[PDB]
Amino acid sequence: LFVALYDFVASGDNTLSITKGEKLRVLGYNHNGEWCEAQTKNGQGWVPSAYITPVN
């Protein structure tokens, strides 16, 4: 369980828009850890790893 730190607008290509404060579930990471595949109420897709952090 994670929370978004900053807004991120999807740039297509299976990225996912997220808003500061939203909760996410993390499925995994790409090969260099820069991208994170996450699930929110809005769907599923890749977000910047640095834009989220664990919560609770």
Partner: peptide, 10 residues
């Protein structure tokens, strides 16, 4: 995942 890097945190 995208082949390009994500934006840096603000």
């Amino acid at each position: 995942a995208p082949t390009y890097s994500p934006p840096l945190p603000p």
